[PDB]
Amino acid sequence: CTITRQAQVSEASPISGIVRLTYNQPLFFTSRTDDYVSHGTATRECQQMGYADAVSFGQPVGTCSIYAGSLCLNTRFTLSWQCR
Amino acid sequence: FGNSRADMEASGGNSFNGKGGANASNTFSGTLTVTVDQVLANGNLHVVGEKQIAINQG
Ligand SMILES: O=C(O)[C@H]1C[C@@H](O)[C@@H](O)[C@@H]([C@H](O)CO)O1
């Protein structure tokens, strides 16, 4: 009902040094993995690339990914980081 | 040819007509403001945008 986890990575573009992670939310569900695992993954991606010290710099973005009539079965939430 | 031994009469016909066609048209006359998603290596911009309108009942 109000339990979700497992926020993973979805994009790592060296051009502009942008890392994007995504996580899922069911219809009547919430999601906040740990507020720190996303930072760790972003830092790992930046280190893998030529940058480092990822910064959140933004706010979560939620766009529906599954449509069932006038509803939203699943919602995708994105976290952006700017490697520096 | 004393009888109708040589009397002859014959007719034959063969008519064929085939046709085919297909059409496909589409038009779009809107204006939408989009946001850049990422900057490519050559400088091209990946743009994504969305607009939701609820006039009434939908
Ligand atoms: O010269 C013949 O061979 C003929 C003349 C015709 O009459 C022909 O039709 C046939 C007849 O079938 C005899 O019965 O005979």
Curated annotation (Swiss-Prot), chain B:
Which keywords accompany this UniProt record?
Answer: Bacterial flagellum, Cell outer membrane, Lipoprotein, Membrane, Palmitate, Signal
Tell me what organism the protein belongs to.
Salmonella typhimurium (strain LT2 / SGSC1412 / ATCC 700720)
Q: Where in the cell is it found?
A: Cell outer membrane; Bacterial flagellum basal body
Q: How does it assemble?
A: The basal body constitutes a major portion of the flagellar organelle and consists of four rings (L,P,S, and M) mounted on a central rod.
By sequence similarity, the record places it as follows: Belongs to the FlgH family.
Q: What does this protein do?
A: Assembles around the rod to form the L-ring and probably protects the motor/basal body from shearing forces during rotation.
* Record's protein name: Flagellar L-ring protein
A molecular function annotated in GO for this UniProt entry is: cytoskeletal motor activity
